[PDB]
């Protein structure tokens, strides 16, 4: 896939890519 918008630990990743 592509757009994942996830956290992890103590990170949140919104970007698409």
Do not use: E
Request: hydrophobic share 25%; proline share 0%; glycine share 6%.
């Amino acid at each position: 896939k592509w757009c994942f918008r996830v956290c992890y630990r103590g990170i949140c990743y919104r970007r698409c890519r």
